[PDB]
Amino acid sequence: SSNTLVEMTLGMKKLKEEMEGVVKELAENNHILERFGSLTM
Amino acid sequence: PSSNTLVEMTLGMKKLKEEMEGVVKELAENNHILERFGSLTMD
Amino acid sequence: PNLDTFTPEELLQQMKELLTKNHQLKEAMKLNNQAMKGRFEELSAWTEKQKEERQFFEIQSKEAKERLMALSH
Amino acid sequence: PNLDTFTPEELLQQMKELLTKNHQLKEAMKLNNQAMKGRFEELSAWTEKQKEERQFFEIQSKEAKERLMALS
């Protein structure tokens, strides 16, 4: 099923990558939140 | 594309869509609080 | 077929993985937001304490100076 | 049943929307991270400023007190 499976495959790969980037930003965000707790010490 | 596959594909897609709706919800809450940080020093 | 195109079973597979991850992200974000709240309350309390403590020494200083003026003249 | 199943075309369309939504989500978190760093540096600076002003007042208070008792 070229152009359709091909397309779905492309789209599923972009989604995966993109969500990897979100996890990245959350990680950073959690790190900053950690330091915040250290501010109040 | 077969029936079984599309059904499971459709079920997954709807779930991802729904799960994402809740994720943006959380994002919105996060934003709300972030805005409030800006006012901690201000009196 | 093409190595670089998913078979239907591979498609379904990718979907299941994405479900897992997305679900993980949701719970992670929920935990992140609870953390935000907690930090907010912590900083709120802490800044307030900083203000009070300054206020105290500021007033103490003011009164000490008033007394210095009144009792020298 | 038949209505409640997506077509390949429709599935693809959801993929596009979902990607877009995830992209917006990622970018919005990038900005949040930047803003938080800002908030953090602002709060660090602020508290340092409060501390300084505090121990300034504390010094001024003690100096007003000993100088008062300095006479006579």
Residue numbers in the entry:
A (entry chain D): 679 to 719
B (entry chain C): 678 to 720
C (entry chain B): 30 to 102
D (entry chain A): 30 to 101
From the paper:
The N-terminal coiled-coil region of OPTN is responsible for its interaction with TANK-binding kinase 1 (TBK1), which is a noncanonical IκB kinase family member involved in innate immunity and autophagy. The structures of OPTN NTD in complex with TBK1 CTD and the related NAP1/TBK1 complex solved in this study not only elucidate the detailed molecular mechanism underlying the OPTN and TBK1 interaction but also uncover a general interaction mode governing TBK1's binding to all of its currently identified binding adaptor proteins.
Among the OPTN mutations, the glaucoma-associated E50K mutation is demonstrated to associate with a more progressive and severe disease phenotype, and causes death of retinal ganglion cells in transgenic mice. To further elucidate the detailed mechanism, we also solved the structure of OPTN(26–103) E50K mutant in complex with TBK1 CTD. To our surprise, the overall structure of the mutant complex is almost the same as that of the OPTN(26–103)/TBK1(677–729) complex. Given that the OPTN/TBK1 complex is a symmetrical tetramer, these additional synergic interactions induced by the E50K mutation likely contribute to the increase of binding affinity observed between OPTN E50K mutant and TBK1. Collectively, these data demonstrated that the POAG-associated OPTN E50K mutation not only enhances the interaction between OPTN and TBK1 but also affects the oligomeric state of OPTN.
